[PDB]
Each structure stands twice: as C-alpha cells, then as structure tokens.
Amino acid sequence: PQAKILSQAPTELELQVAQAFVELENSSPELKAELRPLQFKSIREIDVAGGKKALAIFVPVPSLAGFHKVQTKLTRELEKKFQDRHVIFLAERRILPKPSRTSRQVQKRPRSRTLTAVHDKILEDLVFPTEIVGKRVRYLVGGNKIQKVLLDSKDVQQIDYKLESFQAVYNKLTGKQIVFEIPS
Amino acid sequence: VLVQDLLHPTAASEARKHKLKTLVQGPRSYFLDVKCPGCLNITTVFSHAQTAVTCESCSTILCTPTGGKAKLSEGTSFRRK
Amino acid sequence: GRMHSAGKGISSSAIPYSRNAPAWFKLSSESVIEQIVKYARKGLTPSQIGVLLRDAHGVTQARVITGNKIMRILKSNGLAPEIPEDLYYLIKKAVSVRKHLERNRKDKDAKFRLILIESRIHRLARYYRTVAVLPPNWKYESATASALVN
Amino acid sequence: MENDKGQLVELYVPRKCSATNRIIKADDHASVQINVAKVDEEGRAIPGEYVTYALSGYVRSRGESDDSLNRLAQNDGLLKNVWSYSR
Amino acid sequence: SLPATFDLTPEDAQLLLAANTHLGARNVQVHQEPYVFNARPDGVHVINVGKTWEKLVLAARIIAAIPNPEDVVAISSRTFGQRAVLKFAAHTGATPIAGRFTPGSFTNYITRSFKEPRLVIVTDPRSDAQAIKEASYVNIPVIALTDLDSPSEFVDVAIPCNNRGKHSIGLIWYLLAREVLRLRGALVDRTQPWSIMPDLYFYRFP
Amino acid sequence: TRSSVLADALNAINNAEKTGKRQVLIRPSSKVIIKFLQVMQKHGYIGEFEYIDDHRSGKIVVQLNGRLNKCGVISPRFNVKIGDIEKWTANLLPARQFGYVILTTSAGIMDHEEARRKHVSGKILGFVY
RNA sequence: CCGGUCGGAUUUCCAACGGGGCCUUUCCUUCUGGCUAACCUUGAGUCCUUGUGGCUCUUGGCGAACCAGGACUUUUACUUUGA
Secondary structure, eight states: OOSSSSSSOOOHHHHHHHHHHHHHHHTOTTTTTTTSSOOOOEEEEEEOTTSSEEEEEEOOGGGHHHHHTTSSTTHHHHHHHSOSOOEEEEOOOOOOOOOOSSSOOOOOOOGGGSHHHHHHHHHHGGGTTSOEEEEEEEEOSSSOEEEEEEEOSSSGGGTGGGHHHHHHHHHHHTSOOEEEEOOO | OOOOOSSSOOHHHHTTSOSSSSSSOOOOOOEEEEBOTTTOOOEEEETTOOSOOBOSSSOOBOEEOOSSSOEEOSSOBOOBO | OOTTSOOOOOOOOOOOSOOSOOTTOOOOSHHHHHHHHHHHTTOOOHHHHHHHHHHHHOOSOHHHHSSSOHHHHHHHTTOOOSSOHHHHHHHHHHHHHHHHHTTOOSOHHHHTTHHHHHHHHHHHHHHHHHTTSSOTTOOOOHHHHTTTTO | OBOSSOOBOSSOOOOBOSSSOOBOOTTOTTOOEEEEEEEOSSSOEEEEEEEEEEOOSHHHHTTOHHHHHHHHHHHTTSOOSSOOSOO | OOOGGGSOOHHHHHHHHHTTOOOBOSOOOTTOGGGEEEEOSSSOEEEOHHHHHHTTHHHHHHHTTOSOTTSOEEEOOSTTTTTHHHHHHHTTOOEEEOSOOOSSSSSOTTSTTOOOOSOEEESOTTTTHHHHHHHTTTTOOEEEEEOSSOOOSSOOSEEEOOSSSSHHHHHHHHHHHHHHHHHHTSSSOTTSOOSSOGGGGSOOOO | OOOOSGGGTSHHHHTTTTTOOSEEEESSOOHHHHHHHTTSSSSSSEEEEEEEOOSSSOOEEEEEOSOOSOEEEOSSOOBOOSSOHHHHHHHHSSSTTSOEEEEEETTEEEETTTTTTTTOOEEEEEEEO
16 A cells, blocks of 8 residues: 555655555545556656646556556546646656667667657657647757647547646656647 | 648648648548348448448348449448447 | 559558547457457458458458557468468469460460569569568479469 | 958849849849838828839739739738638 | 728628629639639629728729829720720829720830820720730839739739629729729818719710 | 659759749658758758658658759769869859858768868768859 | 057957767676776875875775786778878
C-alpha cells in the first residue's frame, strides 16, 4: 500500500498519492482488483502559466494499455483530491545514442529507441484519449522553428482547459514549442 | 490568380478533387451496419465490397458486387459504422 | 508507367491516415489472429484472406489491429507456402498460354506475348535469389514448367 | 550604389512595382500608376491627397490586374468583403 | 475608412433588382469567378450586387481625384450606350466619344481628333478593344463595364454588370454619374435622392 | 524516372516566379531540400515556409518575395578542392559582389563565403542569386 | 568607445566573427603495470590566524600527465593540414 505502487522510490509527495491511491481503491470494490496490480516508476512537478502547477506520472512501459482502460475515471479524482494541479500520464522510454563513424561496434539499435521516435510518441500519450489528425512544422524568418498539432474534435472538452499546461511539460522535456489547434 | 492561401483550402472544393490529389490523401469509403429481417443480427460490411456476403446464421444473400460500389439487396436496413 | 506496355493510369487504394484502430472495433487481437489461421487451413493466400476479412468481419487492416503483417503471422505458425505467392501466379499464367500452344500453331501473335510473360519471371527471380528466400539453384524452365507446380 | 566617400552615384533610382516587386524601366509603356481620393468627414473629397498604386507592365497583359487591385486596396481599408484569401 | 453614409441603401438596390442587372451570362471565364454568387438551375448565374456597388464607389474615387474634369474620356460603340455616355459627359465635363472610334487617335498627333487623356472608361471591351489596345501604348489606366464574357486584359477596376439589357447598361452610368458629383461637393447631402429621373439616360428608337 | 528530388524542387520555384506568383508547392521533401532553403532564407531571398507531413515524405509550401532571379542545381556533384572555389564562382555568378554557390562540406551545408573563413571544402550543390 | 600623447600604450567596455567547455536519458570501449603531478586515507611535517587545510610526509584510496604490454573493435569513396 505504501512501498507497493512505487519501484525503489521513497519520497513522501508520491507516498501521499499512494495513500490517495489506496483511498480510492478500497472505496471502489468493483474496481480494486483491476486498480491493484499496476504501479508507477516516479513523478515530477512543474509550474504552468495558469498560476499553478501540474503533475507527470512515469509508468513502466508495457503497463500503458493497463492504465488506459481506467484512465478517465481516476484522473479527476486526484483533481478534486489535490488542487491547482494537472495530472499527466506518461510512459518511460529509453534513447540510445547514434553510433559515430569511429566508434566501437555494439549491437545495432532498433528504431524504437531513436530520438525522433520517442518524442512523437511522447505527444500521443499526453493527449489521451483524443487523437492527432495532422501536424505541421513552421519555419520562421528569424531562424526559429515552432510546430503545430491538429487535434480531433470529439472529447476535447475534457482537455481544452489544459492546453497551456501542455506547452509547459513538452517544453521542459525537450526544448520545443507547440501550439495546439483544433479545427472544426 | 497570383496570390492564394494554399494551406487552408476551402472544403467546398476539396470534395471535387481526385482521391490522391488533395492536400493529404485518404479514402472516400465507409462501413455499414446492415440487418436481415430473419436473424435480426448485425454484421459490418464494406461499401465497395467485392464478394457477395451472407449472414453467418441466416444463410441469405446480402450484397451483390459490381462496378465500383456494391448494391445492397432489398428488404433490409443499414446505418453508417 | 506499366513496364511491357504503354499505358499511364494510376488507381490504387489510398491508405488512411491514422495508425490506430477505429473506434468502431469491439474485438481482441487474439479473437482475430486465429481467423487468419482458420482460413490458412482452408488453403488461401494472404491476398484472399484480407479481402475476405475486410468485406465480412470489418477489419480494415490486419497491419494495424494486430502487430504484424499477414505473411509474418503465417510464417510464425508454419502455414507458409514454399514458393512466394506472386512468383507462383506468373508460373500458372505461363502454362495456360503454353497449353494453348499445343493446340494452336498459326498464332504468330500470342507467341510474342509469352516471351513477355517469361521475361518478367527472370526479373522476379533475380531479386528473390539475391535476398535469399529462394535457394541459389532455383531456375525456371519449360521442363520445370511441367515439374514444380504442374 | 555609393562610393567610398558616401555619395550616391547612380543616375536615378527607379520605381518598383507594387503587385510583384519587379522593376519598371524607361520603356515599359504599359506601366500604369493610379491615384485614389481620400474622403472627408462630411463626405467630400480632399482635392490634394491621394493613395498611390503602381502596377507593372505584365500583370496587366495576362489580365491579373484588377484582382491585384482588390488585394492591394483592401489591405488599406478602402473596401471590405470583395476579396478573399482562401480561395 | 468610409462611414455608414457610404453603405448600400435598401432603396438603391431596389432599383437594381428591378432593373434586372443581376443576371450574368451563362459562361463564366476564369478571371471573374469571385463575382458569382450562385448558379441558377435554369442555366444563368447571379452576380453579387453587394460586390458590384462596392466596386462602384471606387471608380468615382478615381474620377474625382483628377485636376481637370475634361481629361476623362468615355467611349461606346454599341447603340445601347451611346445616349448614356452623352448625358454622363454632359453634366460632368468628360469628353465623350460615341459611334466610331478612329484608329490611331491616341497616337499620331497629326490627326485632328488627337487626345491625351488621364482615364478611359469603356463599356463592352469585347467589341471595343481598339480603345483598349491603343491605351496600352501610352500609360492610360482604364475602367470597364465587365460582363462574364469579357476579356479582362489591360483593364483595371472593373464594374460587374449585365451588358445585355438596355436599362442595365444605362443605369450603371447613372449611378456612377450620381456618385461622382457627390464627391466633388457639387451636391449637398448623401441621403437626399437625385432629382433627375433615371429614365433620362436610357435609349429609345421609334 | 525520378532521380533527383532537389533538382526539381528548385525547378518548381523559378518556374513559378517568372510568372510572378507568391507561393509554390513542393513534393517530396528531403533533409537536403530544407537546408538548401535555410540558406536562401538567412540571406533574404525567400520568405518563410511550412512543412506538411502525411506519413510518406511531406510536401512544402514556400512564400516568395520578389528577389530571386535564378536558383539552380549542378547535377554531377563534383569535388571542389580548396584552390578551386574561385574558378567555379567566376563562371556561375553575375557579379563579383553578390550571389552565392553552396557546398556540401564535412562540417555541414553552407555557402561559399562561409566556407572560406571556416577553411573547409567539399562537393558542389547549387547556386543562388 | 577610449588618446590618457615627454602613431603605440588602453585603464575599460561594447557589436559581430570563428573556438573551446561542461549539463541535459547521450562518446574512446577498456586492462595491467609503472609513472608523474594531483585529491585524499592512518596521520602529522611544511609554514602561514591554530588543522586529516592544501602544500605535500606517512600508510592508503583514487581520477590525473607518460612510457610499456595490451585489450578488443565493420569497411571504402571525398575533403583539410603535414612530411
């Protein structure tokens, strides 16, 4: 209940959300089985432009499909539990470097560990459960370059108030700029 | 014309171009939820489907294939996807 | 622009944009990966499988709903044919014109539509030999026309 | 163009077009230049003030002149709702 | 930058739809496709009248911006216009041209008919292009009364009309002639209607 | 059939700036198209551009000012030494004080003044004025 | 910029233009020896406010410069500088 949900991570600020995890768990008798066997790796906190903060959960990789079946109806439970926050659900990928010409030969890296193959996934989980329908990258005159993410138009009322916070976490993790844009 | 916004084309003209030659291409087909009077069960079906399908239980013909789009049979109802 | 012709048309399917399942799919990968092998035992190509799967059970692409392609699934379960499928169809087409020739001899025309069909087989066979899915002594011949499939 | 000391040493700098930024030389004898009249609060016209447009020789010959007027004028608030970017 | 007194009067457009001037020809060309509102199921296309007035005040903002009011020239060669040009040029001061244009009259100063204008206003540039083509040699801007079968080469600000009816050719001169005087200060108030009957500008033969 | 992608990604530009348009549409994009474009953009010859992607190889939509006379490509990419830039530059360019020829060089794709003060050389790629 | 003057200093700051360096999920891939400076280990000499202070003495952990054995590691084309 306390050292369960983590994996070698003693820090109180997620121990309380572990405490928050079991408090919704035991009050959910029809769910406490399927809310049980999950875990998460770590967590981090960052501030947004709405005068408040946000949360990013780090989950071990193959448990992503496990989290997504319950992803909706636990999200706002912490939002009413803890205030002025925004909880984000991210996986935890791994990026091998690129072998230079004069380098000692190791096993050849599969494509799923390449730097441009993590970041395009690290958008897609972050905007769950709505879908991306197209992208554009814009090349300015002053040598700077920002992108643009066309989202879908169905469930966006769940997420539309978080789009400023989304630009914070993606800027912090990468160093890139994103303007979300929902056509009709 | 000499000046035109190529990146935000009008939806009224995109409907007329060829399947390939729009901005980002895609299908113009869909899927139907057809029902038979007898078995009263559902079966998804392609629109331009080229094999004459039948229900799994009520072994009765459903959609004759020809040309470019399949023609449905009579005495049946349908609904998009 | 049509090798061994002079036509210039363009008409294929146009693959949709999303690399995910549609929201109107209500099944599992396990409950669909076995209908592929359930028709492989009926002796079907990949080509007949997918069109039968799409027009009946609504799977748009096995590529996206299961993690693999069709032939990869069939190779893992040992249901794979020996000769690759496209090459086999040029062979079967090549005998039907050959069988016509034992009954016809005053056709100067369709003599010179067989040297075209045979020419596309050496093109196919160089590639399959080089990537090594055919053993490097595979050769086609008129005697091996009436030998390996016939 | 100007020398080491600093003074301009052309003969005289020529007029750029306004629809396509070309350059209009001394034998472009279809190079129209057009003024319109500013307006008054009562609804009259000032006799001395203008807004000036210069159109090249070849945006007129192809026939692309009037649309290039409507594009150019509407940025300066002369018209409203007669030209549209997303065609 | 033009106040609400310059907006379209509901009384004004009552004339235009009465005058049947919102019926284009049955074959658009590729340059005038912004001017078409919608096609009728009969086969005709309906001009956008709110566009044909918005590009009507613009021409008068060019005609009023000239020093000498005898440097405008207005031309027709069809029968249907060559009264309306005269009463236009009557009480404005332009130098009208009716009937036949003689060739080489904007070049070749040894003719007696030699002129050196500042604008040119044509009606039907299909069957009138001699004045169009010669003005291309000597830096003369031009204004036309364009149909939807109108070769719009060399032609700047272009009033969309119906060049088939008889009222509709005349009326556009009249509303142009009404508006050019208001800008000069020769009238008093925008909101008062014009004292002259607009049927004066028409054409009639026994 | 389609052999060089860059060679007709610059043939699409000046073919639709001789007619005085303002924007063009390129297809397919490339990693060496974009960097050729990014050196005609830090010198002012073109405006800005956008990259579509459609999961195959994207298109590009470029915005042209008024300032290009010609941009081009040199098709065997030969091997420029370092004493031989100034014979390539006395032949391709209209005058001695403007225009550029750009190179693929072991420290990136750059123009020919920028390669002088870094003291490198490489293979030729094209020109712009 | 500053000259400050019985053209050369620049106290001193600015624009560019090229170069290092670290940190960001991320570059030589290491090993054993000496080996030299360097942090430190049992701990003071050394001399400065008195020191397990370093400097450096003593045992002891090391990275750290150099020689020597290695130890293994796809291969070219082109271009830069040298003999």
